Design an enzyme around this catalytic site. Structure first.
Site: not given
Lengths: 5, 99, 99
Positions: B25-27
């Site tokens: 998850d880059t978020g």
């Protein structure tokens, strides 16, 4: 902070 | 490897003698795993996401094997619908976004 | 380009004559933008994230320019703390994760 659906 | 985003980027993680699947998850600024049995001391903490804030427990100096890549860092345990590998960890494994 | 994850991956988006910043989120199946003035019909819908479910409005066939890259797709508008570019869109712009 942190993921959708 | 190289992950295209047609399906969720799920990967095998090995944490404290257990095998799990986690979403890259880059978020996420942090890594939050669902309640698992982890040894050591932890402190109370709160993280926000799209519907609110959940209280988690922070564990520092935690070893994790993300798709065979070892890294040490902060891991948050709590009521998450999925095991999330966040930015604190992605940087350790030299993970980038390309387009 | 290539984005390393030392800082949040923020990028310029242009949606319906407005300029915004959005986070590239591999952890999101969908794209959810904060309440903005968008024209057209929309339906009620609900998305979950780490603290819960929020109700949003779905707009289909929406044009967006992500870091100069045009794409058309589904865009959810609601009470999100950040403008999120999700998987439905990332695939359109040929975005991948490498490590």
């Amino acid at each position: 902070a942190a993921x959708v659906x | 490897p190289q992950i295209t985003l047609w399906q969720r980027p799920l990967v095998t993680i090995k944490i404290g003698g257990q095998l799990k699947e986690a979403l890259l998850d880059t978020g996420a600024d942090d890594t939050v795993l669902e309640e698992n049995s982890l040894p050591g001391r932890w402190k109370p903490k709160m993280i926000g996401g799209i519907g609110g804030f959940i209280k988690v427990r922070q564990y520092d100096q935690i070893l994790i094997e993300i798709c065979g890549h070892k890294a040490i860092g902060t891991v948050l345990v709590g009521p998450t619908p999925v095991n999330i590998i966040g930015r604190n960890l992605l940087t350790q494994i030299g993970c980038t976004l390309n387009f």
